[PDB]
Amino acid sequence: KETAAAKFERQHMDSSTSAASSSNYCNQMMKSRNLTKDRCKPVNTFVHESLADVQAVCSQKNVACKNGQTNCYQSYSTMSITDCRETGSSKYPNCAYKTTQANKHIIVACEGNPYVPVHFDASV
Numbered sequence: 190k191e192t193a194a195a196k197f198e199r200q201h202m203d204s205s206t207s208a209a210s211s212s213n214y215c216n217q218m219m220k221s222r223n224l225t226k227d228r229c230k231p232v233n234t235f236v237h238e239s240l241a242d243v244q245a246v247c248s249q250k251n252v253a254c255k256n257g258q259t260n261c262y263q264s265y266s267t268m269s270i271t272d273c274r275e276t277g278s279s280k281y282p283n284c285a286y287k288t289t290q291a292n293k294h295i296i297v298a299c300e301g302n303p304y305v306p307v308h309f310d311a312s313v
């Protein structure tokens with residue numbers, strides 16, 4: 190259906206906006222990106238930077254991933270991101286999210302050739 194790289198783009202990339210367009214951004218994005226189809230994915234981060242800039246992170250700061258692996262890389266500088274966290278009232282099928290706009294360093298897991306971001310590890 191898709192590739193691991195394209196899946197990262199679907200779940201974590203939104204280069205069309207410099208930041209969350211409204212407090213309802215996460216409710217809209219989580220749905221349109223098919224992240225609430227089977228269940229309400231609890232947490233998710235979207236990156237408001239060009240693909241090239243996020244892909245460049247694979248050549249930046251090598252750090253360990255949350256799972257112990259060491260194919261993770263942290264951005265040298267901060268990026269415009271939107272943290273989407275499911276609200277306490279949220280209940281599938283009616284997924285509801287709190288939209289939080291921030292500027293933080295991102296940590297992504299890189300794989301393949303071309304070595305590109307495939308998993309979003311965290312924002313710091």
Ligand SMILES: [Cu+2]
Nearest residue numbers: 265266267294
């Ligand atoms: Cu920095």
Ligand SMILES: [Cu+2]
Nearest residue numbers: 193300307308
């Ligand atoms: Cu993987």
